[PDB]
């Protein structure tokens, strides 16, 4: 899976670039927690320089655009350019929930190798309307995937749990640590995940620092067995503790507008027991979330 070669670690996947912290919707257990953050935009010279040293020890097949709504961004093709820059991956794809999408100029699709549209029903996209993006994105040479989305996953809770048998079972499959390999970069450091640096600060006790789950991005010699070690090591994160990884329950698809987004429900209570089971066999088993999905490969 993630592999060193031509002494450089080798995520097959994708290197995660949140764009804007928060967002326009407020989906029920979004990965991310975008609903409870503030206005937060990442700095094009900022990302670009951290991502240039990274980039001396570490390569992507793509670098994924996102963040809680990217297209919230001032300058998203600003942002795109400084990550192609970077040469820390083969590609640049930008994932959306698709509302703003209408705003984007040519500038933006002539910047963009990959388009993903997360479609939910509170916020439906007419079929009128993706036809058009996906003519769009076969002018500008750009792959396009449409998923609609029928349920999410629990994700996590304030009440989290004291049983290491549990952690152990949501960590050793979930999949954002080892199947769909969600590396994440933020402020300098870099995480297994989205959960371990977004979600801690947010138990509203306070959590904890994130940087106990990550690793500071540096590019002294040293470095790149340090990365090699972070990202294969196998044992729980202290974020797990509090996060239901890939075996939360499912829930239909919906947003909670009212206030009180915060989880407080025993995890426990949370887990998805038959599916962890099933996922303990097969870790790449479908999550049941994606009820249709389209795709418009360009190929390469
Ligand atoms: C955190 S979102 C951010 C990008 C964009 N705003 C979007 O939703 O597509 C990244 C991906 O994770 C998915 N996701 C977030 N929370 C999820 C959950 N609780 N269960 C299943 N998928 C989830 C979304 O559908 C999306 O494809
Ligand atoms: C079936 N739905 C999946 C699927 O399309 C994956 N395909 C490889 C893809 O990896 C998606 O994205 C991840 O979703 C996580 C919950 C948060 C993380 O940040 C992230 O990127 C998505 O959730
Ligand atoms: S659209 Fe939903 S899943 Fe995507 S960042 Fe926003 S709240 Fe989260
Ligand atoms: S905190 Fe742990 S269980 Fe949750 S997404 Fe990250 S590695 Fe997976």
Request: charged share 25%.
């Amino acid at each position: 899976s993630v592999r060193l070669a031509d002494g450089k670690v080798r995520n097959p996947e994708g290197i995660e670039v949140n764009a804007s912290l928060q967002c326009n919707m407020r989906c029920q257990s979004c990965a991310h927690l975008s609903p409870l953050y503030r206005r937060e935009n990442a700095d094009p010279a900022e990302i670009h320089d951290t991502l240039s040293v990274l980039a001396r020890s570490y390569h992507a097949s793509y670098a994924k655009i996102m963040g809680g709504e990217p297209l919230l961004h001032p300058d998203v093709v600003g942002l795109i350019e400084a990550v192609r820059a970077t040469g820390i991956s083969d590609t640049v794809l930008v994932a959306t929930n698709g509302t703003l999408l209408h705003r984007a100029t040519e500038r933006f699709w002539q910047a963009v190798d990959s388009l993903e549209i997360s479609v939910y029903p509170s916020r439906m996209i007419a079929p009128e309307e993706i036809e058009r993006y996906r003519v769009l994105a076969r002018e500008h040479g750009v792959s396009l995937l449409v998923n609609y989305y029928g349920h999410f996953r629990a994700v996590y809770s304030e009440s989290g749990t004291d049983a290491p048998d549990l952690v152990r079972d949501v960590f050793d499959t979930c999949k954002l640590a080892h199947f769909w390999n969600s590396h994440t970069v933020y402020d300098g450091w870099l995480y297994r995940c989205p959960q371990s640096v977004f979600m801690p600060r947010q138990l509203r006790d306070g959590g904890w620092d994130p940087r106990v789950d990550g690793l500071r991005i540096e590019d002294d010699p040293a470095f790149l067995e340090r990365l090699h070690r972070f990202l294969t090591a196998d044992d729980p994160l202290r974020a797990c503790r509090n996060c239901l990884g890939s075996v939360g329950k499912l829930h239909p698809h919906q947003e909670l507008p009212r206030a009180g987004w915060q989880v407080t429900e025993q995890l426990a209570a949370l887990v998805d027991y038959p599916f962890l089971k099933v996922c303990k066999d097969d870790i790449t088993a479908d999550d049941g979330c994606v009820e249709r999905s389209l795709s418009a490969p360009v190929g390469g």
